[PDB]
Design a protein around this ligand. Structure first.
Ligand SMILES: O=P(O)(O)C(O)([C@@H]1CCc2ccncc21)P(=O)(O)O
Ligand SMILES: O=P(O)(O)C(O)([C@@H]1CCc2ccncc21)P(=O)(O)O
Ligand SMILES: [Mg+2]
Ligand SMILES: [Mg+2]
Lengths: 340, 340
């Protein structure tokens, strides 16, 4: 709830992010700057803002309260919004690739009549805005290069993980043999854990002058495990979550994804069960999807996940004991409350 | 031909670029690193390499010959390859958006069975490789941040121009009223001139320690005019070029693009001619495309372009007289020979 209390100030900072990214007036590019406005306003607004808020929360907890001036706070909010622009970049492009229908309780940007594959460019523009903001707000700060490199490396890591995800789920093809626990863990580490958990904390760290490689290493050790659980929960909720809460309809089964659920199913299924999965997974047909979900419940995977969450919670807590120091344990515990 | 003579060394450096971008062995990401190899090898190889070579040529002409050690040359070749990775990023994604068929004398990457919209991620990976290479080769150099920012700003500029291009060509809609000379010039300035001409020269400049804002301003003044002509010639060749040479089939007419040709047509057409254009432009049907081309030749636009090229050549030469100094005129004249 340190989140709920940073939230409203964070969110109302968006008008400012937009204003400053539109103050590029070169009246010739006006029309394009109007399209970027639309893209920002549809695509970085409507989510929970947990990643960006994490930057703002950690900043408050890591920076000497006396050093938390109005300007250095403005920068923290900006850097928070940079993390959210990164997520918007990935979501817009991934919804295209995944043939998704809805996101954050509206139709996907690319599904909007008049948009379509132009959304590929809109998504690149959102990524570009990250670096314009880091320049506008942070160029004179000691950690400038630290942040640029962090965001660029995070993106690379995320794209490499998405590569592994897509390679593991070739379309129109059967292959449950690809869906291993080792593969799953690598996927989610790269595609999710680095940018969703390491990135926002590291960002705050760099901003507070904590640049030591051992401190980042120790932070990473906790944050990457949190990231893995988070992706696992996102997988479970793809099928068993309520779209009123998730804000989107799940496609993992028909997309032939190496989801946590399918990996657990394969670990538990009998040869017969295996064959049902083989016949029905990775296909567009509602009755086929329904059969897989029936098999998952058949195997009580909702209960397996509930037990995994508890085991994971306990393990993450152990890691925080082991690795949090020299940083305030609250930094990690705020995050843990948010996700468990 | 300073190009032809830098070329073979530049091109053979590619195996090294690839090797070092694959030496990320984390055996878990092996499969993804294999996909990146494929993507590099299909998408950054098969073009003329003029943009990357321009970095290498300008570097030779701008750097004290005594300062041209083996290491600082390796960096010049790397930075050249960075410009080519930027072009590969844009081409892969733009071919998707433009529904293109072929590029550089093969089928487009995304049209390859097994690829499709996954190419969106492959293209982002290529962009990511730029920054991994700048880090691997250039992180300890004084101009590191200069280069990072140049590449990021160039991308932003290019994406903003593509935004204007796509907004000016709404699909399924008539509108020749959008196709003005003022609009055309803004489009090509942003979408083409900055990254194709300013970027590679500026890069060499920064590498040679020439960072003064007046020197970059003067360079820009010539390079941006060259860029505009280059896009004009690319437009003309979209329809009237030979696909054996261009390596791709032109879609500007059926894509409803604000091309140089359509702008000139509109300036010259009678009300009747206007109506033929209105009925036939921006549509998929071969007979409709054929009618527009017939109207263009009807108006002798090939001859208009031939005269424009000569006028443009003379004007660029005047600009080089005016603005080249303090830099070797050869820097700009090599480029001019390459494009005219
Ligand atoms: O689409 P979401 O379920 O929100 C997902 O978690 C998000 C979407 C964008 C993105 C990028 C990296 N990792 C996860 C996600 P995905 O399941 O696609 O991997
Ligand atoms: O597709 P090409 O004709 O090669 C083009 O010149 C290239 C393709 C990628 C790109 C990016 C920016 N400017 C021009 C191009 P376009 O006509 O699409 O604008
Ligand atoms: Mg998901
Ligand atoms: Mg063209």
């Amino acid at each position: 709830d340190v989140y709920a209390q940073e939230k409203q100030d964070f969110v109302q900072h968006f008008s400012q992010i937009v204003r400053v990214l539109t103050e590029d007036e070169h009246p010739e590019i006006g029309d394009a700057i109007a399209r970027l406005k639309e893209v920002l306003e549809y695509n970085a607004i409507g989510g929970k803002y947990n990643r960006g808020l994490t930057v703002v929360v950690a900043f408050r907890e890591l920076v000497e309260p006396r050093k938390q001036d109005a300007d250095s706070l403005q920068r923290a909010w900006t850097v928070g919004w940079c993390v959210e622009l990164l997520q918007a970049f990935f979501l817009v492009a991934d919804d295209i690739m995944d043939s998704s229908l809805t996101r954050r309780g509206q139709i996907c940007w690319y599904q909007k009549p008049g948009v379509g594959l132009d959304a590929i460019n809109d998504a690149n523009l959102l990524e570009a805005c990250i670096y314009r903001l880091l320049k506008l707000y942070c160029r004179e700060q000691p950690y400038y290069l630290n942040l640029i490199e962090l965001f660029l490396q995070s993106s690379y890591q995320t794209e490499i993980g998405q590569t592994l995800d897509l390679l593991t789920a070739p379309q129109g093809n059967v292959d449950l043999v690809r869906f291993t626990e080792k593969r799953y863990k690598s996927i989610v580490k790269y595609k999710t854990a680095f940018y969703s958990f390491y990135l926002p904390i590291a960002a705050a760290m760099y901003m507070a002058g904590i640049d030591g490689e051992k401190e980042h290493a120790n932070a990473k050790k906790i944050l990457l495990e949190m990231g893995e659980f988070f992706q696992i929960q996102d997988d479970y909720l793809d099928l068993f979550g309520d779209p009123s809460v998730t804000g989107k309809i799940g496609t993992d089964i028909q997309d032939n994804k190496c989801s946590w659920l399918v990996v657990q199913c394969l670990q538990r299924a009998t040869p017969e069960q295996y064959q049902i999965l083989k016949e029905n997974y990775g296909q567009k047909e509602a009755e086929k999807v329904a059969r897989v979900k029936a098999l998952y419940e058949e195997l009580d995977l909702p209960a397996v996940f509930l037990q995994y969450e508890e085991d994971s919670y306990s393990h993450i807590m152990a890691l925080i004991e082991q690795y949090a120091a020299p940083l305030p344990p609250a930094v990690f515990l705020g995050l843990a409350r948010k996700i468990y």
